[PDB]
Design a protein around this ligand. Structure first.
Ligand SMILES: CCCCCCCCCCCCCCCCCC(=O)OC[C@H](COP(=O)([O-])OCC(O)COP(=O)([O-])OC[C@@H](COC(=O)CCCCCCCCCCCCCCCCC)OC(=O)CCCCCCCCCCCCCCCCC)OC(=O)CCCCCCCCCCCCCCCCC
Ligand SMILES: CCCCCCCCCCCCCCCCCC(=O)OC[C@H](COP(=O)([O-])OCC(O)COP(=O)([O-])OC[C@@H](COC(=O)CCCCCCCCCCCCCCCCC)OC(=O)CCCCCCCCCCCCCCCCC)OC(=O)CCCCCCCCCCCCCCCCC
Ligand SMILES: CCCCCCCCCCCCCCCCCC(=O)OC[C@H](COP(=O)([O-])OCC(O)COP(=O)([O-])OC[C@@H](COC(=O)CCCCCCCCCCCCCCCCC)OC(=O)CCCCCCCCCCCCCCCCC)OC(=O)CCCCCCCCCCCCCCCCC
Ligand SMILES: Cc1cc2nc3c(=O)[nH]c(=O)nc-3n(C[C@H](O)[C@H](O)[C@H](O)COP(=O)(O)OP(=O)(O)OC[C@H]3O[C@@H](n4cnc5c(N)ncnc54)[C@H](O)[C@@H]3O)c2cc1C
Ligand SMILES: CCCCCCCCCCCCCCCCCC(=O)O[C@@H](COC(=O)CCCCCCCCCCCCCCC)COP(=O)(O)OCCN
Ligand SMILES: CCCCCCCCCCCCCCCCCC(=O)O[C@@H](COC(=O)CCCCCCCCCCCCCCC)COP(=O)(O)OCCN
Ligand SMILES: CCCCCCCCCCCCCCCC(=O)OC[C@H](COP(=O)(O)O)OC(=O)CCCCCCCCCCCCCCC
Ligand code: HEM
Ligand code: HEM
Ligand code: HEM
Lengths: 123, 146, 534, 120, 122, 116
């Protein structure tokens, strides 16, 4: 028997689950992408072939998704490092969390705007 | 009236019960790390005698000392496997030797454990930076840079 | 039906139970029977201090404490045991500290003490700063410390084991206690623990009142068990009703109002306590304060709540269950709030309870361990669990038109409207008729589980039986005592008749079924130096 | 005493310190790649070759590779330790992780160290 | 409170103080040497510039001081290694110290003579 | 602690890898075209102009040297009677292994076809 139920606890819990998910995302991408970059010790034409197949609109929205993942992971990791090293850290947990929510929204709407204007002028 | 009790708390991060008089003294680190850091200082000193003093001799005293040194001199010396390996061994042995020595120095001049932690972190950072920069310059050097 | 061969067997895990367990832990092969976990015990509810004359902040000796404790109990306390308790009280507090308890410390670093109630300088002069405390949470720290030490010395706890009766073996020199028949809640299996000594530390019994301050698990089972085995109970009609009682439910309000400017304003918009009892503002004894408030109501909201029971199993100083006035049951000990060593007498002084449990739990544990070392196993009768197994089976396999909840609710409502802070003759007789009707209704009740894994209506019904017995004892004793002394207070006879009633009253169970009679004998009060005066 | 003593303390500290460094490394990489001149739409072999003709970017990319791979490998070690129920599964998954991490570090280091602009 | 006390102990104590000081001196100098040598991967002219500024009389005196530091550190480190490995080391401490004083004197005055000749002929 | 368990496991795993590495090396060297009788500087230079063979030889060097050094550590531990002898023999082994790894890695990393 296995019951299925949602705990509905702190917001730091959802921060941690997003942290874990985005970290694993970047790890798998990094494996694949170090390979395709290692294709540069083979041929300029091989490298150009591959990275040109990386210039499609699907891969563009995926670039936006990966930008989001790395940005959230970086901000939340700063929060975690602060909690651990700063002695008054655990008191301002939720303050830091709201601050990095704000920073993420700002920087990410800016980054989507820039990447979007590039994708627009490229079509 | 009596005598107020002595406070045993050194700093906030330090359990006073760690320096209890009757508390058993047991090792507070990786086992057999100090033995091998000690042995490393001895052996790397034996090697560094030759490496460092030969470097100093050839640089300062051989033909015209520093007054002959320039890019072309460096580029002629590093065109030889002998001098390439000599300088790589010198860099690695000297930096690990000095970094372990300054580990000892910090450990016995820093009064607080927080100061000790952050000075050891600064030391490890500076040593890593110098090692990667020196290794990069040695490995990826080309005389035809311009 | 398992059977364990043991030595000193402690029934309870509160302050007294775990004190006895840390004493008789190394000395013998001890088992502790608890129906809760050791840290869910009432002791943990204790917010106040624990007073012992350590003389750190001020100077005070143990004779001042002895006088305070003898005058508080309205001259019914055995002054032998009072002296012994104070003298051992100093060292009991010190031993708790040396076991690791986090007391509050003085600028110099010994132990901090603060004032409490009627602990006065010498025979009524000034408060003394006597009560040693840990925080707003003193009983919890005592409980945690004793449990940590029982963990350290690896005591064998039997958690959630409802001890339902004891096996008394009869010998030519009388009866002798052999084993305890327990009911493991977790598996339904009856266990029989064979012991040489048996310590009862099962706490008090306030749950026979509607509005009370005791845990839901404080029904009174040491009292009920030793009262069913034929042994007597001492002066059960002395219940201390606390004044601050959160008129809604009954929770105690000794949280903050105690050591501050609590303006007891009641009636419509008036203050009363000095209109009634001047010469002291509001630190009068708890029983006096409660009588005042109640007779005021008879002419944040608070209301008195049954708080403590001064009666219980009669006991010597070394912790032995004396059978009648001078005999003793061999191999049977008692400690804590279930035991009546006759220290509080007719009214309990605040902070003397944790003190009492420490002192006399230690004494009873030592005594039971040394008895188990000296003597040996005597015998046991044929399959001594027949009565308990028949009891449980009869309760289980039957169907009746009564529910434990309704019987218990009616018992508590009657015992609260009648045998309470003010009780009268016709009042107590109404209570007696009500309890007899409820006792004959308890014969036909039902349980709705019939399982054997975690059966709780079963034990709820058994505890209701215990409550009915003790309620009968209380009402009949309080109908007997025709005076107003201490927590007891009658409106027919409103002043302390010291010519006939300066004597403990003891109740013996004649029959064996529920509806039976009770014989009321007497017991003299040991007197050393403090003759009555007021 | 289940593993190497004081290994967990230093893995913990390494995650913190490599995070502090990877903020700059990874976010500067992403910035300069995606939102500087034409983003991806300027990237090709010539772009890579003129970027890797600079000690700055060479050391930047090697530090990024090593820090990111050791960081991710330690994090996935933690994830495996928290999700694998059988000890044999945990053993073989940690071995697969170690193999893939070693292969990626070897390949990336080879490419960086050996890259030559004039290949054809 | 803090008092200022010179303990005035063994000569091995002053050997150890000098060993510690010269070792830290070499460590900091080596940080700087490795940076200014890393300057050899940017251009010939930048390297030539900074080392031409390392060929002044002040930096010549500093290089003599660095020769002294490295020489004493090496010699006293040989003494320390012998004390730790050779089983008759602790007996002959304080004769090793005289030996290395003499060795330092001869090697140092020879080296300073050669370096002073180089610095004169310019 | 736990150093012997991991040295044991390393011998097993490096053996599995070294089967392919060392036996492919021996095959391609001795019994492909003319065996040794084709080997010279030009052969080495055209073999080491390939990422395949470069990584093959570096993996072979590192795995073979750490494997052999651990095995000889075991042999010394089983044959040396005095603790001083064991100490100085393990130090000589560590020195020779480090020197060989340093020299082989230098040669691989720094090899240039156009030397004269
Ligand atoms: C130019 C060429 C020169 C070459 C340079 C070589 C490179 C350096 C090599 C390192 C070798 C060590 C040098 C000293 C040797 C021994 C001397 C000694 O032990 O004296 C200790 C002795 C101990 O005194 P104490 O009574 O025990 O402590 C009193 C405290 O000072 C009173 O304060 P406190 O008690 O409250 O606590 C002290 C403090 C810590 O005390 C410190 O001051 C240490 C500061 C270290 C910096 C941290 C960098 C970490 C980098 C991590 C990356 C991995 O603790 C804190 O409050 C925490 C603050 C630290 C925060 C660190 C994180 C912030 C940045 C991280 C992110 C950055 C974003 C980008 O006195 C000193 O503290 C002297 C300070 C040493 C300064 C030497 C400077 C040398 C390099 C400067 C180059 C110019
Ligand atoms: C493409 C880009 C993507 C990037 C790829 C990244 C690559 C690195 C990934 C690193 C992290 C991996 C995944 C991390 C997530 C952790 C989640 C988790 O742990 O949940 C476990 C979750 C619950 O674990 P469990 O309930 O405790 O065990 C239930 C067993 O499944 C039920 O099994 P069982 O009860 O029957 O017994 C356990 C069984 C199963 O054991 C395993 O699960 C092992 C699976 C890995 C394969 C072994 C490769 C070994 C390589 C050795 C090299 C050194 O073990 C055995 O029976 C022993 C036989 C295995 C022998 C293998 C050795 C043979 C070759 C050696 C010589 C080769 C000759 C040449 O179930 C899983 O096992 C899911 C596996 C995840 C698949 C990997 C996904 C990424 C890799 C895919 C590559 C394409
Ligand atoms: C050419 C291609 C070939 C490839 C070469 C490969 C190179 C790596 C080889 C690695 C493995 C080595 C051999 C493994 C086989 C193990 C068989 C075995 O253990 O049986 C031991 C067997 C029985 O041992 P035992 O009965 O317990 O001891 C009896 C003693 O012989 C009786 O002696 P004792 O009772 O009088 O006392 C023990 C004595 C003897 O202790 C030794 O045996 C040590 C021998 C090694 C020489 C020390 C080099 C240290 C390098 C330090 C660098 C860090 O120790 C001492 O007295 C202390 C003095 C030694 C001080 C050495 C340090 C001075 C230089 C440091 C500073 C340098 C300044 C610059 O007898 C042997 O000792 C045979 C020695 C094997 C010779 C090595 C063969 C290959 C190397 C030859 C190179 C050419
Ligand atoms: C709210 C409140 C506040 C109080 N404040 C104070 C104060 O400030 N100062 C003070 O001195 N006193 C105070 N008291 C009273 C005092 O704490 C008690 O005298 C003391 O707690 C007595 O505990 P005990 O050792 O008798 O056993 P308790 O801790 O009362 O518990 C009895 C134990 O026996 C076990 N047990 C019971 N029945 C059975 C059974 N049938 N089978 C097996 N095991 C059983 C239970 O597991 C339980 O742990 C307070 C009481 C209450 C309710
Ligand atoms: C509200 C306040 C904000 C606070 C919290 C916000 C948390 C949001 C951060 C998490 C979002 C990203 C998680 C997962 C993204 C992802 O799945 O991306 C993968 C792609 O998976 C997908 O298919 C998803 C496509 C992207 C979705 C579009 C936006 C992402 C989510 C937006 C969240 C809101 C902002 C990456 O694939 P790849 O590594 O293989 O890329 C290869 C590139 N060559
Ligand atoms: C009795 C005989 C003596 C026995 C033992 C003698 C031991 C004494 C020698 C140890 C000298 C330690 C000096 C270390 C500090 C030092 O001098 O160095 C600084 C330099 O300080 C000076 O200016 C020193 C001036 C030179 C004189 C030093 C020699 C003194 C030794 C005399 C011995 C007795 C004759 C820093 O220079 P730098 O490394 O930063 O240079 C960078 C180059 N680009
Ligand atoms: C464990 C720690 C490891 C540290 C690794 C992190 C490295 C991250 C990136 C750092 C790269 C450093 C390489 C420098 C190469 C470079 O800039 O030099 C490369 C530059 C080209 O830079 P750009 O193309 O980006 O403009 O060439 C120049 O023309 C620079 C002109 C003069 C610069 C002098 C720098 C020489 C050495 C001084 C280093 C400064 C550090 C000071 C510390 C006190
Ligand atoms: C040139 C030959 C050298 C020899 C023979 C040598 C020898 C030694 C020895 C044996 C020690 C340990 C001293 C002790 O523990 O008491 C030591 C310490 C030290 N070494 Fe070296 N060393 C040499 C070069 C260097 C170099 C090149 C550096 C730095 C780049 C250096 C920096 C240090 C430092 C800082 C210490 C710590 C001093 C102390 O803790 O007392 N040494 N040296
Ligand atoms: C290549 C880039 C990165 C990769 C592959 C990566 C991967 C991971 C993974 C898989 C985890 C495990 C998450 C978990 O255990 O719950 C993790 C944790 C962590 N990451 Fe990263 N991450 C990267 C970048 C960063 C950055 C830029 C920071 C900036 C501070 C950072 C800070 C942290 C911290 C502090 C942790 C520890 C979290 C914890 O222990 O709870 N990481 N990383
Ligand atoms: C070619 C494929 C190889 C395989 C499959 C292999 C396998 C093994 C294994 C499993 C062991 C452990 C034996 C034990 O623990 O009892 C071992 C031991 C050893 N190996 Fe290898 N090995 C290989 C190649 C090599 C190479 C290339 C070297 C040296 C360069 C080497 C040197 C040694 C030595 C010296 C031992 C110690 C023997 C002992 O302690 O009994 N082996 N080998």
């Amino acid at each position: 028997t296995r019951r299925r139920t949602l705990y509905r606890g702190d917001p730091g819990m959802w921060s941690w689950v997003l942290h874990r998910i985005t970290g694993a995302t970047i790890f798998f991408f990094l494996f694949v992408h170090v390979l395709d970059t290692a294709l540069v010790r083979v041929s300029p034409q091989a490298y150009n072939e591959v990275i040109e197949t990386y210039k499609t609109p699907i891969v563009g929205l995926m670039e936006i998704g990966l930008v989001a993942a790395v940005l959230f992971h970086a901000l939340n990791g700063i929060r975690v490092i602060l909690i651990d090293f700063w002695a008054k850290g655990p008191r301002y947990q939720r303050q830091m969390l709201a601050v990095i929510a704000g920073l993420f929204l700002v920087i990410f709407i800016a980054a989507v705007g820039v990447i979007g204007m590039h994708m627009v002028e490229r079509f | 009236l009596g005598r107020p009790a002595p406070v045993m708390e050194r700093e906030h991060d330090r359990p006073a019960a760690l320096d209890h008089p009757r508390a058993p003294r047991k090792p507070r680190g990786i086992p057999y790390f100090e033995k091998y850091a000690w042995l490393f200082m001895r052996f790397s000193g034996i090697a560094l005698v030759f490496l460092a003093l030969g470097h100093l001799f050839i640089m300062l005293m051989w033909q015209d000392g520093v007054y002959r040194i320039d890019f072309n001199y460096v580029a002629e010396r590093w065109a030889s496997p002998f001098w390439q390996i000599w300088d790589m061994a010198l860099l690695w042995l000297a930096m690990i030797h000095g970094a372990n020595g300054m580990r000892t120095i910090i450990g016995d001049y820093a009064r607080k454990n927080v100061t000790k932690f952050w000075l050891n972190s600064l030391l490890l950072l500076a040593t890593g930076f110098t090692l990667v920069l020196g290794s990069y310059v040695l490995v990826t050097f080309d005389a035809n840079i311009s | 039906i398992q059977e364990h061969r043991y030595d000193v067997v402690i029934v309870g895990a509160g302050g007294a139970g775990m004190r006895a367990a840390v004493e008789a832990g190394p000395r013998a092969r001890t088992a502790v029977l608890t129906k809760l976990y050791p840290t869910r015990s009432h002791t943990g509810a204790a917010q106040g201090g624990m007073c012992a004359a350590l003389a750190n902040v001020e100077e005070d000796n143990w004779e001042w404490h002895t006088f305070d404790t003898v005058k508080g109990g309205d001259y019914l306390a055995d002054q032998d045991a009072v002296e012994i308790m104070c003298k051992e009280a100093i060292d009991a507090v010190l031993d708790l500290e040396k076991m690791g308890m986090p007391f509050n410390r003085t600028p110099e670093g010994r132990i901090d003490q603060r004032r409490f109630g009627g602990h006065t300088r010498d025979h009524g002069k000034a408060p003394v700063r006597r009560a040693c405390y840990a925080a707003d949470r003193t009983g919890h720290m005592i409980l945690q410390t004793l449990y940590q030490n029982c963990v350290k010395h690896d005591v064998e706890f039997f958690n959630e084991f409802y001890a339902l009766d004891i096996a008394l073996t009869e010998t030519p020199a009388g009866p002798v206690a052999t084993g305890v028949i327990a009911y493991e809640l977790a598996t339904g299996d009856i266990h029989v623990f064979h012991a040489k000594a048996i310590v009862f530390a099962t706490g008090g019994s306030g749950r026979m009142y509607k509005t009370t301050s005791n845990a839901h698990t404080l029904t009174g089972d040491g009292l009920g068990i030793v009262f069913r085995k034929g042994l007597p109970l001492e002066d059960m009609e002395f219940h201390q009703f606390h004044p601050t009682g959160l008129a809604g439910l009954g929770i105690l309000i000794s949280e903050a109002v105690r050591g501050e400017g609590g303006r007891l304003l009641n009636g419509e918009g008036e203050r009363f306590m000095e209109r009634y009892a001047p010469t002291i503002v509001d630190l009068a004894p708890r029983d006096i304060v409660a009588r005042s408030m109640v007779l005021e109501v008879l002419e944040v909201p608070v209301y008195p709540t049954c708080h403590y029971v001064m009666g219980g199993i009669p006991t010597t100083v070394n912790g032995q269950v004396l059978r009648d006035n001078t005999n003793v049951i061999p191999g049977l000990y008692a400690a804590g709030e279930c035991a009546c060593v006759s220290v509080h007498g007719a009214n309990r002084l605040g902070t003397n309870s944790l003190l009492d449990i420490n002192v006399f739990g230690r004494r009873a544990g030592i005594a039971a361990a040394e008895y188990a070392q000296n003597h040996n196993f005597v015998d046991m009768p044929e399959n001594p669990a027949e009565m308990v197994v028949g009891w449980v089976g009869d309760i289980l396999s039957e169907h009746g038109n009564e529910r434990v909840a309704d019987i218990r609710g009616a018992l508590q409502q009657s015992m609260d409207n009648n045998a309470a802070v003010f009780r009268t003759e016709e009042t107590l007789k109404q209570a007696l008729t009500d309890i007899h009707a409820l006792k004959e209704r308890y014969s036909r009740i039902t349980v709705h589980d019939k399982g054997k894994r975690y059966n709780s209506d079963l034990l709820e019904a058994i505890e209701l039986g215990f409550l009915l017995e003790l309620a009968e004892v209380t009402v009949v004793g309080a109908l007997n005592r025709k005076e107003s002394r201490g927590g007891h207070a009658r409106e027919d006879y409103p002043n302390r008749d010291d010519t006939n009633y300066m004597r403990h009253t003891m109740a013996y169970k004649q029959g064996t079924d529920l509806l039976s009679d009770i014989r009321l004998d007497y017991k003299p009060v040991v007197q050393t130096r403090y003759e009555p005066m007021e």
